[PDB]
UniProtKB/Swiss-Prot annotation, chain C:
Binds to host ACE2. RBD also interacts with the N-linked glycan on 'Asn-90' of ACE2. Cleavage of S generates a polybasic C-terminal sequence on S1 that binds to host Neuropilin-1 (NRP1) and Neuropilin-2 (NRP2) receptors. Interacts with host integrin alpha-5/beta-1 (ITGA5:ITGB1) and with ACE2 in complex with integrin alpha-5/beta-1 (ITGA5:ITGB1). May interact via cytoplasmic c-terminus with M protein. May interact (via N-terminus) with host bilirubin and biliverdin, thereby preventing antibody binding to the SARS-CoV-2 spike NTD via an allosteric mechanism. Residues 11-13 are annotated as: Integrin-binding motif. It comes from Severe acute respiratory syndrome coronavirus 2 (2019-nCoV). This is Spike protein S1. Changing K25T: In strain: Gamma/P.1.
Length: 223, 214, 49
């Protein structure tokens, strides 16, 4: 068994910095290059940098050149990434990975990734707006109530209904970033339509990083 | 700066079926291409290195070959755990460049969404803005879009869309499209409509409202 | 006329490449036998050595 354990993620203001670490266990660093890979939310992987543990030499991606610096320590058996002058453009999950020699070999084993976020709005709690059900005939006789969870930062926000009691028929979207620099997501509950006036339908949006939540009751509108 | 072109953008194949994905480097990268699988909430895992060498811990189902300059990843027989977006990277020289990712879908029976529309309400309009919301629920396949109309004309440049994750059993998903208008723009038009279209819909679903209605 | 005993140490999944008419990392860049090859290939796990 080989392990790569990431740490050091968090929230950074534009122009700030963050030092990330990745510990190795079950293997040495020497003879291998340690690499960092960036994954912006909603995107694929981007190379950041690599260091040959038995070299001390490094190489960097153009996308992070100058701004990011890497190193490795074979006594501690750990890899590091120093990210300076961070921008909103740098929001991503930061992964550590290993490969043999300086190059020509793919990254075999990866750590799990630590999220680092940057925005013009350092933080905001969510607010929630309703979505009315259709009052017209529908296929299957079903209908749904919903809401929009708006203007919060950072992501994740977990959404469930009726204080976690209603998971059945629950459909939520991942958040996307708005022009406000803040995130928003939609959600609904689909049930036989007569249930929309019987069951409780409260959007419960949970955001642990700011110790907050919004409990929003959604009910049919007359229309 | 060698880029990775991939095709198809997505592939539909059922469990037990064969999947092929092609990665095309813009320049010579020798045989240093590597393939990855990633699950939501998890690290990427190496499947194949040095073009055709199987990585430890990876099932034999993942194999591949080169012909001329074209390299293909093959899943000999799909299992429920082999549905992921697969990525290529080139390790030959630096910088390492990654491709966009090819999504493999379960090829479930294709069908239309349950569609709902919510016209901007009087309460929502208190913000000084208007937002028209149209939702397509529990449908399949992954490819869908909404064409918006105003006064029966096509709209463009004033809409946004978001898409959710696929269901753990049926791989269905929902799509949500919106229009953004200032209250002042909302006031300039009378009829709004959501035209739903995708592979499983034989007749596009049109939902509509008059300004001020619900 | 002659017999040649060629030898090397490989991975288990690579024993399948030591044959004429083959492709793969060894078959293409490390060791080949001709399509009209006359000979026998013997291989044995040496993990304890």
């Amino acid at each position: 068994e080989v392990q790569l354990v990431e740490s050091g993620g968090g929230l950074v203001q534009p122009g700030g910095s963050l030092r990330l670490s990745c510990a190795a266990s079950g293997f040495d660093l020497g003879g291998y290059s340690m690499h960092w890979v960036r994954q912006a939310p909603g995107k694929g992987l981007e190379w950041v940098a690599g260091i040959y543990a038995s070299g001390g030499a490094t190489a960097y991606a153009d996308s992070v050149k100058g701004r990011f610096t890497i190193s490795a320590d074979t006594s501690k058996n750990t890899a590091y990434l120093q990210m300076n002058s961070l921008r909103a453009e740098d929001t991503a999950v930061y992964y550590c990975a290993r490969s043999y020699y300086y190059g020509g070999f793919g990254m075999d084993y990866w750590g799990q990734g630590t999220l680092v976020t940057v925005s013009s709005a350092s933080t905001k709690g969510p607010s929630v707006f309703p979505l009315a059900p259709s009052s017209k005939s529908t296929s299957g006789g079903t209908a749904a109530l919903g809401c929009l969870v708006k203007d919060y930062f950072p992501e994740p926000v977990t959404v469930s209904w009726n204080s976690g009691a209603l998971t059945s028929g629950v459909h939520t979207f991942p958040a996307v970033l708005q022009s406000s620099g803040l995130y928003s997501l939609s959600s609904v509950v689909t049930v036989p339509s007569s249930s929309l006036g019987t069951q409780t339908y409260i959007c419960n949006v949970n955001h642990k990083p700011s110790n907050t939540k919004v409990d929003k009751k959604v009910e049919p509108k007359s229309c | 700066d060698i880029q990775m072109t991939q095709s198809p953008s997505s592939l539909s194949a059922s469990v037990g079926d064969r999947v092929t994905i092609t990665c095309r480097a813009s320049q010579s990268v020798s045989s240093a291409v590597a393939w990855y699988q990633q699950k939501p909430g998890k690290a990427p895992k190496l499947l194949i290195y040095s073009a055709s060498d199987l990585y430890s811990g990876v099932p034999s189902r993942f194999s591949g070959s080169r012909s001329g300059t074209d390299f293909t990843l093959t899943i000999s027989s799909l299992q429920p755990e082999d549905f992921a977006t697969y990525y290529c990277q080139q390790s030959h020289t630096y910088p390492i460049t990654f491709g966009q990712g090819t999504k493999v879908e379960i090829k479930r029976t294709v069908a239309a969404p349950s569609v709902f529309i919510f016209p901007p309400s009087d309460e929502q309009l208190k913000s000084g803005t208007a937002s028209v919301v149209c939702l397509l629920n529990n449908f399949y396949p992954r490819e869908a879009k909404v064409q918006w109309k105003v006064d029966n004309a096509l709209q463009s440049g004033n809409s946004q869309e978001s898409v959710t994750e696929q269901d753990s059993k049926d791989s269905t998903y929902s799509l949500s499209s919106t229009l953004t208008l200032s209250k002042a723009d909302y006031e300039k038009h009378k009829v709004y409509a959501c035209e739903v279209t995708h592979q499983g819909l034989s007749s596009p679903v049109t939902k509509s409202f008059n300004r001020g209605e619900c | 006329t002659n017999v040649y005993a060629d030898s090397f140490v490989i991975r288990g999944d690579e024993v399948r490449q030591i044959a004429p008419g083959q492709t793969g990392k060894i078959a293409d860049y490390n060791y080949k036998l001709p399509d009209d090859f006359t000979g026998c290939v013997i291989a044995w796990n040496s993990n304890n050595l």
